[PDB]
Amino acid sequence: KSKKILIVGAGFSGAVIGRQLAEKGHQVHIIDQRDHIGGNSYDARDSETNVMVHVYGPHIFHTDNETVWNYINKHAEMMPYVNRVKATVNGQVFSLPINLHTINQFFSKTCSPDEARALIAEKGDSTIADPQTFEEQALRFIGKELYEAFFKGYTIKQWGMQPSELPASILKRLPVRFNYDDNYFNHKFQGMPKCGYTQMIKSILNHENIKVDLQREFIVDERTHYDHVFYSGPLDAFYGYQYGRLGYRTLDFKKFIYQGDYQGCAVMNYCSVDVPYTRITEHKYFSPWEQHDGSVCYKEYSRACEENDIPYYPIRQMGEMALLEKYLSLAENETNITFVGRLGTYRYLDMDVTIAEALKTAEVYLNSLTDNQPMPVFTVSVG
Amino acid sequence: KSKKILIVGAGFSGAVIGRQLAEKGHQVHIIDQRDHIGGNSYDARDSETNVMVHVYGPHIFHTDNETVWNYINKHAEMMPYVNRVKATVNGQVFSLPINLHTINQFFSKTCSPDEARALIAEKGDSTTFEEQALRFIGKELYEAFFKGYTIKQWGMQPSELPASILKRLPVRFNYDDNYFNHKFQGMPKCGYTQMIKSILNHENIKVDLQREFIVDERTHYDHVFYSGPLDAFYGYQYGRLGYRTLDFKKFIYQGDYQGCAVMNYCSVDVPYTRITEHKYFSPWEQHDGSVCYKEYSRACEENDIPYYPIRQMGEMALLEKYLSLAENETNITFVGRLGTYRYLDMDVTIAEALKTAEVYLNSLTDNQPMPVFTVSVG
Ligand SMILES: Cc1cc2nc3c(=O)[nH]c(=O)nc-3n(C[C@H](O)[C@H](O)[C@H](O)COP(=O)(O)OP(=O)(O)OC[C@H]3O[C@@H](n4cnc5c(N)ncnc54)[C@H](O)[C@@H]3O)c2cc1C
Ligand SMILES: Cc1cc2nc3c(=O)[nH]c(=O)nc-3n(C[C@H](O)[C@H](O)[C@H](O)COP(=O)(O)OP(=O)(O)OC[C@H]3O[C@@H](n4cnc5c(N)ncnc54)[C@H](O)[C@@H]3O)c2cc1C
Numbered sequence: 156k157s158k159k160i161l162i163v164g165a166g167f168s169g170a171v172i173g174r175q176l177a178e179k180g181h182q183v184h185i186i187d188q189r190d191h192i193g194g195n196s197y198d199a200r201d202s203e204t205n206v207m208v209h210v211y212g213p214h215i216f217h218t219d220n221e222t223v224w225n226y227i228n229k230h231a232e233m234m235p236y237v238n239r240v241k242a243t244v245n246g247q248v249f250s251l252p253i254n255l256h257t258i259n260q261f262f263s264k265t266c267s268p269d270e271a272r273a274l275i276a277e278k279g280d281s282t283i284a285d286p287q288t289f290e291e292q293a294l295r296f297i298g299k300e301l302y303e304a305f306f307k308g309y310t311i312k313q314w315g316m317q318p319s320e321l322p323a324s325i326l327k328r329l330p331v332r333f334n335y336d337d338n339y340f341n342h343k344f345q346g347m348p349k350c351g352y353t354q355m356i357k358s359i360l361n362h363e364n365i366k367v368d369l370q371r372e373f374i375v376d377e378r379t380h381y382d383h384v385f386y387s388g389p390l391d392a393f394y395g396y397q398y399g400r401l402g403y404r405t406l407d408f409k410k411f412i413y414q415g416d417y418q419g420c421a422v423m424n425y426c427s428v429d430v431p432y433t434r435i436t437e438h439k440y441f442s443p444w445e446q447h448d449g450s451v452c453y454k455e456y457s458r459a460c461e462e463n464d465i466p467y468y469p470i471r472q473m474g475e476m477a478l479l480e481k482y483l484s485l486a487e488n489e490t491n492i493t494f495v496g497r498l499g500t501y502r503y504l505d506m507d508v509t510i511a512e513a514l515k516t517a518e519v520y521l522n523s524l525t526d527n528q529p530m531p532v533f534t535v536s537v538g
Numbered sequence: 539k540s541k542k543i544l545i546v547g548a549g550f551s552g553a554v555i556g557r558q559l560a561e562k563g564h565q566v567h568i569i570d571q572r573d574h575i576g577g578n579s580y581d582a583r584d585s586e587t588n589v590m591v592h593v594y595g596p597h598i599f600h601t602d603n604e605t606v607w608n609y610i611n612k613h614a615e616m617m618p619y620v621n622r623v624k625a626t627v628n629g630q631v632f633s634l635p636i637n638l639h640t641i642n643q644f645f646s647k648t649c650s651p652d653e654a655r656a657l658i659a660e661k662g663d664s665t666t667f668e669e670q671a672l673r674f675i676g677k678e679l680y681e682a683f684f685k686g687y688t689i690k691q692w693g694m695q696p697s698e699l700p701a702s703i704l705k706r707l708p709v710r711f712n713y714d715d716n717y718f719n720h721k722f723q724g725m726p727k728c729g730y731t732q733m734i735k736s737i738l739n740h741e742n743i744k745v746d747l748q749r750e751f752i753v754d755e756r757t758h759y760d761h762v763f764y765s766g767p768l769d770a771f772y773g774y775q776y777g778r779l780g781y782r783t784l785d786f787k788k789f790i791y792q793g794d795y796q797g798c799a800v801m802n803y804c805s806v807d808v809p810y811t812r813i814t815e816h817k818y819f820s821p822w823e824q825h826d827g828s829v830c831y832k833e834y835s836r837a838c839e840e841n842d843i844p845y846y847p848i849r850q851m852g853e854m855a856l857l858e859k860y861l862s863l864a865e866n867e868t869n870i871t872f873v874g875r876l877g878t879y880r881y882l883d884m885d886v887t888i889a890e891a892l893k894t895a896e897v898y899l900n901s902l903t904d905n906q907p908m909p910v911f912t913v914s915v916g
């Protein structure tokens with residue numbers, strides 16, 4: 156039987172789930188409260204300069220998942236692109252992530268890889284058995300000088316808290332490299348779609364069994380016209396924010412135009428706490444295969460997400476997790492709905508992770524029709 | 539009618555010309571005086587470390603030519619790779635080619651691209667190599683990055699050399715440190731030797747190694763394609779075309795000796811020109827043991843492999859005399875870096891070889907004479 160499907164959101168989560176089910180003969184209705192598709196991945200051109208702007212932040216595709224990589228290659232031309240971030244601090248410009256060039260520049264040395272290991276080991280504090288905090292992880296592995304130059308001020312700005320109050324996991328992620336490789340990402344596949352993510356998602360949305368209505372909020376009365384709802388809007392918003400709002404950081408993007416090359420790279424971090432923006436992005440450098448004389452730039456400022464701001468990074472401390480638990484207990488009592496995505500599950504997700512989870516979630520719904528069982532509320536562990 | 543074709547050299551030029559004609563039914567005899575195929579592109583695995591070594595120095599494939607890219611992708615799997623050269627000088631490490639990071643780090647500034655343009659304009663003269671440098675980038679940069687390395691590389695002071703070359707390396711006022719601006723760039727997964735081995739794999743191709751060209755052989759063939767040195771072909775009767783040669787001192791490090799494929803040393807007081815750490819040309823492989831080369835530049839004497847053609851006034855006048863006798867040859871075409879006395883990238887060599895076979899095939903169907911050169915050189 157051709158099931159009737161409501162999908163709330165036309166970002167990756169919605170577009171991908173809706174595409175898998177269209178292909179199996181289901182009638183998919185995809186709604187979005189915005190006047191364009193794409194969700195947080197939306198990009199669009201600026202009038203004046205013709206620069207393709209990544210409107211909700213630089214969106215660099217990177218994955219080790221060849222399945223996901225092949226999927227997006229059916230819907231776009233993926234161009235090579237290697238993210239190479241610079242950082243301004245202490246009247247100097249550095250290479251990130253921390254590598255052999257950064258170390259040799261910062262400490263004015265000409266160390267080989269093995270000499271740099273010994274130098275950083277000496278600066279590190281190996282008397283810390285298991286770093287719990289962001290500060291401890293930095294003091295254990297990179298030492299005070301590097302910590303205070305590149306990490307402390309940036310991290311206070313980004314998070315609104317002292318690094319002694321943030322988890323070690325945040326920094327556990329970042330490569331301390333003892334060679335001259337300055338690719339920001341380790342993933343095997345990496346790039347940017349030639350015509351942008353909007354066009355890519357438009358291709359994913361281009362199927363006979365998909366209708367997309369824009370400028371249309373979800374209304375709780377609708378659910379009864381559909382056999383199943385996939386919801387990628389905020390979990391707390393779905394329940395009227397009745398227990399309070401899940402905490403997020405948000406960003407203000409302050410747009411400006413320059414006639415020429417404003418900074419000469421896509422991403423420049425400002426690691427000093429005394430520079431009020433976290434970074435400056437110059438969007439034309441995300442599309443290096445194009446030429447543009449004019450340039451759209453963003454200064455980016457991090458702040459607590461208030462009622463009307465777009466939620467970007469989930470805070471996910473005990474408070475926020477306690478709040479999350481209360482929304483979970485209502486969710487578990489639902490039937491015929493599945494909460495997905497960054498907003499539906501209160502998790503930061505990369506594009507390729509979002510895509511993989513959407514493929515899985517469609518798969519689960521297909522298998523559950525074939526097994527005449529019930530579709531669960533979450534297809535991923537969130538507790 | 540299938541022609542008997544003799545091809546001298548089993549590098550890119552010979553291999554590609556020979557495959558194009560083998561495919562069209564011609565009988566192809568390729569010879570090479572060395573004990574291996576591949577010419578100067580030849581690579582091989584060191585026994586001890588299993589590292590694929592670029593025997594005649596680093597070879598990075600780069601091209602804007604999509605026909606050529608597609609052509610090698612038929613014979614190899616091209617792995618992505620971006621050449622990113624570092625340079626040690628004055629107690630610091632920098633990226634090359636000179637870019638906005640080099641400038642900022644060198645002068646201790648936080649310039650934007652236009653601010654750096656104004657900084658370099660100031661430092662330039664306004665008041666040849668040593669001329670173009672001082673006018674365009676200033677004393678400090680010229681002396682740090684160019685003056686020492688140029689003397690070591692060419693064996694001459696820069697005061698003695700033409701504006702071009704440096705004109706070919708403009709300061710980049712952005713943070714892009716890719717050595718090559720070309721659309722396509724990569725390394726073959728199994729190395730150039732396999733890639734050339736596949737180009738040579740055809741029933742109509744016979745390859746003989748450790749085999750010297752002998753002029754007496756010419757009369758056994760309908761045509762010869764010659765990719766060995768043009769001057770040698772004519773017995774060096776007017777003198778030897780000037781080249782720089784290179785010596786490589788091999789060593790083995792257990793670990794990562796320097797942490798990048800190529801580190802240049804720009805100081806004249808450092809005797810090698812650069813150090814290459816070969817495992818960095820294959821970043822998809824992992825190797826605990828590392829093969830490295832300190833690299834030294836000298837005048838190419840009679841027993842040395844010729845690397846860089848000098849191509850200054852005397853050498854070009856000398857070339858001209860060998861051109862003017864090649865032009866009266868029949869049933870022979872001179873090709874390649876060595877046959878035409880030019881430095882040629884691998885992509886350009888492949889593009890010219892494909893065009894050379896094409897001109898030959900078209901010369902048979904039109905009953906026309908095959909020219910001696912298929913590119914201009916005089
Ligand atoms: C600042 C930032 C930078 C990032 N950079 C990268 C990066 O470089 N690389 C990378 O891989 N990932 C990056 N990401 C993550 C990436 O954006 C996500 O993986 C992707 O957006 C997740 O897609 P989604 O469809 O699940 O959610 P979303 O894109 O948020 O889409 C959800 C959609 O639901 C709609 N909606 C919500 N509620 C309703 C409702 N009530 N009624 C109707 N419509 C509704 C919204 O309008 C939205 O369009 C970044 C994320 C952020 C926040
Ligand atoms: C130091 C150096 C670095 C380079 N780096 C790059 C790079 O990074 N990227 C790039 O694209 N290109 C690079 N190149 C250029 C690259 O090597 C050439 O494009 C390639 O060698 C050209 O192939 P060929 O067949 O024309 O010449 P060769 O490879 O030189 O082959 C000529 C062959 O002919 C044989 N031969 C000569 N005379 C005789 C004879 N008398 N009898 C029998 N056989 C003979 C020789 O033994 C040799 O095998 C580099 C070159 C040099 C010198």
Ligand SMILES: O=c1ccn([C@@H]2O[C@H](COP(=O)(O)OP(=O)(O)O[C@H]3O[C@H](CO)[C@H](O)[C@H](O)[C@H]3O)[C@@H](O)[C@H]2O)c(=O)[nH]1
Nearest residue numbers: 242251305306307309310313325326329424426468503505
């Ligand atoms: O110059 C810098 C750069 C980073 N950081 C610290 O390192 C953290 C990680 O920063 P990234 O800019 O490298 O990462 P994002 O927060 O932009 O996104 C990262 O974290 C996400 C989880 O929230 C995803 O896992 C994603 O794949 C990963 O790149 C920052 O919050 C910050 O605390 C600094 O202190 N200084």
Ligand SMILES: O=c1ccn([C@@H]2O[C@H](COP(=O)(O)OP(=O)(O)O[C@H]3O[C@H](CO)[C@H](O)[C@H](O)[C@H]3O)[C@@H](O)[C@H]2O)c(=O)[nH]1
Nearest residue numbers: 625634683684685687688691692703704707802804881883
């Ligand atoms: O640290 C350096 C590096 C280079 N140079 C000067 O710049 C010239 C160019 O040298 P590169 O190492 O940049 O390049 P190659 O000479 O090895 O080969 C280059 O020039 C060739 C022509 O000979 C080809 O066009 C090729 O594609 C291109 O990479 C040198 O002769 C040298 O005099 C310096 O002064 N200092």
